[PDB]
Amino acid sequence: ACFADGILPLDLDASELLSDTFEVLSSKEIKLLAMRNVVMQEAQKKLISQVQKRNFIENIIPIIISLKTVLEKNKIPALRELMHYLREVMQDYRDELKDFFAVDKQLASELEYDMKKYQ
Amino acid sequence: QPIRDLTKNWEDQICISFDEGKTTMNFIEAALLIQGSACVYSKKVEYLYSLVYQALDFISGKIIPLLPMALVAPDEMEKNNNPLYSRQGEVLASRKDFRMNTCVPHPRGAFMLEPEGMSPMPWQSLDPFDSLESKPFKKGRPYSVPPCVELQDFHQWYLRIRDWEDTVQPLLQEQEQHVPFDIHTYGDQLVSRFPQLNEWCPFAELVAGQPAFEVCRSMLASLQLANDYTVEITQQPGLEMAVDTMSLRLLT
Amino acid sequence: SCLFNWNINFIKMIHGTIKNQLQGLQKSLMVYIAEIYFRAWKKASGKILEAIENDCIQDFMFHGIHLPRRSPVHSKVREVLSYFHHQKKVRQGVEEMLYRLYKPILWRGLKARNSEVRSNAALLFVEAFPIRDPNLHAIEMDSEIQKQFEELYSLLEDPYPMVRSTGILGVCKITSKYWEMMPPTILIDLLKKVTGELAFDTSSADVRCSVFKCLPMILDNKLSHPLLE
């Protein structure tokens, strides 16, 4: 939110801030080991996992759109880290994220195209 | 209930308490008031799984390295056995409270806490998004105009919508220079057109010489004065011969 | 064309073969191959044609964006793509499939920080204009033309001089071709922008020479002769 405020001076320093926070966000270990009576506990763990990750997505997407807009406006070199992290966000969910990114605009088509390139 | 199938796509006598335990509810009542709860549909379905899991639980219910030795506090009786006192003679601390007593000499003269350990001695493509030198736009004159006046040498050189507008628009201007019509002033004017108040005289004669729109405004004023029960219209009895034979009689 | 129609799976080995053998053949042979692939698209239909749309042309233009200009094959790639941009007017519906092809890949190519790949993106863009989507309404027509307006505005406000020069020549071609289509306020604003500022760009002389390369082919505009005068 402090990044997407724009009150910060966005520069090469802020390029390094954004970029290394992107590989903080794109770490493998940021997700829980639970999704990586006891079978019922596993069941409720992954249902909790779907609801927290969809809450996380609906929180992040407006501020992602704002920060990517001002980031491409400044030609900040962390945009490759943007399209790095956002695509592992895209290999979380295959079709319902395409529906939520059909609610969003001008981001999905490049995402299916890179995903096709990854296969 | 699509979620009931979606619980079944995985694979009543119970009391469920919403919130913090204040409310008491039966399962058929609890699940159905929460199906219309004060959340977004994604949050509502989330709460609905948590209810199914909490109810189902109740239905089912019925490496280490060596430790450094200096990390251990010494025994209290030992510290009583060697106390350290002050210039005034009062006991201030113990001797084991400080670590130079546990320092170990070296042949070089060094002191370490742990003697155990190491002693000191053609189809490739461009990479995208590479900023290069962008020479910015700068404004100025590359040009010079010398007026030297207001000198040559030879040897150097020697070597129906339109119809609709035309039909209807003059009528629109004709409406714009229509006479301004106010109901009270026109009613008083039509009354003054009569020789005297409450006198029968042909109203067609009084509107004779007026244009068609003024005649229609006059009969509209007559109709309004008739409908307000103030002025009485006297027409000929019948249907078709009553035309142009009305007369205004100003009763009130 | 019917060898392409025969086996869908053989098309990727065809793609590899034509990847291997672009260097040998000449410019007329390149536009001949481009005619072959145009008729190959035209005869194709169905899921094989959909796989060809998701297989061949987007990879060629992706390469032509990303190939260095040092490579001689890069010249062949954008000349056959310019042939395709010339043939899009001949057949109707070609504009829509290239729009749905270029919905991912034109837009980030516009803001490509590297000057060469953005220069190639501008080279395809200036002939790409206008882009049409048939099903969209008049609000979306005005929105997409205003989007192209601000896109060419930013592309002519580029800091690099050669990207500016390509943008100049492109809007010269635009103002020559379809000056009747744009609103007059937009036209007056763009001509004032490219005349009051651009003629005195002391950073580079050849950008003003590119404006000079533009000036004869705007002079066909009969109605704007007092306005340019």
From Swiss-Prot, chain A:
UniProt subcellular location: Nucleus
Coiled-coil region(s): 78-119
TM segment ranges: none
Known disease link: Microcephaly 22, primary, autosomal recessive: A form of microcephaly, a disease defined as a head circumference more than 3 standard deviations below the age, sex and ethnically matched mean. Brain weight is markedly reduced and the cerebral cortex is disproportionately small.
Record's subunit section: Component of the condensin-2 complex, which contains the SMC2 and SMC4 heterodimer, and 3 non SMC subunits that probably regulate the complex: NCAPH2, NCAPD3 and NCAPG2. Interacts with BRD4 (isoform B), leading to insulate chromatin from DNA damage response pathway.
Described function: Regulatory subunit of the condensin-2 complex, a complex which establishes mitotic chromosome architecture and is involved in physical rigidity of the chromatid axis. May promote the resolution of double-strand DNA catenanes (intertwines) between sister chromatids. Condensin-mediated compaction likely increases tension in catenated sister chromatids, providing directionality for type II topoisomerase-mediated strand exchanges toward chromatid decatenation. Specifically required for decatenation of centromeric ultrafine DNA bridges during anaphase.
Name under which the protein is recorded: Condensin-2 complex subunit D3
Swiss-Prot record, chain B:
Residue positions where Phosphoserine is found in the record: 119
Coiled-coil annotated spans: none
Record PTM Phosphothreonine, positions in chain: 7
Compartments, as annotated in UniProt: Nucleus; Chromosome
InterPro entries (UniProt xref): CNDH2_C, H2_M, H2_N, Ncaph2
Protein family membership: Belongs to the CND2 H2 (condensin-2 subunit 2) family.
Complexes and interactors: Component of the condensin-2 complex, which contains the SMC2 and SMC4 heterodimer, and three non SMC subunits, NCAPG2, NCAPH2 and NCAPD3 that probably regulate the complex.
Function: Regulatory subunit of the condensin-2 complex, a complex that seems to provide chromosomes with an additional level of organization and rigidity and in establishing mitotic chromosome architecture. May promote the resolution of double-strand DNA catenanes (intertwines) between sister chromatids. Condensin-mediated compaction likely increases tension in catenated sister chromatids, providing directionality for type II topoisomerase-mediated strand exchanges toward chromatid decatenation. Required for decatenation of chromatin bridges at anaphase.
Protein name, as recorded: Condensin-2 complex subunit H2
From Swiss-Prot, chain C:
Cellular compartments annotated: Nucleus
Disease: Khan-Khan-Katsanis syndrome: An autosomal recessive neurodevelopmental disorder characterized by multiple congenital anomalies affecting the ocular, renal, skeletal, and sometimes cardiac systems, defects in urogenital and limb morphogenesis, poor overall growth, microcephaly, and global developmental delay.
Name of encoding gene: NCAPG2
Protein's name according to its UniProt entry: Condensin-2 complex subunit G2
Subunit structure: Component of the condensin-2 complex, which contains the SMC2 and SMC4 heterodimer, and 3 non SMC subunits that probably regulate the complex: NCAPH2, NCAPD3 and NCAPG2.
Function: Regulatory subunit of the condensin-2 complex, a complex which establishes mitotic chromosome architecture and is involved in physical rigidity of the chromatid axis.
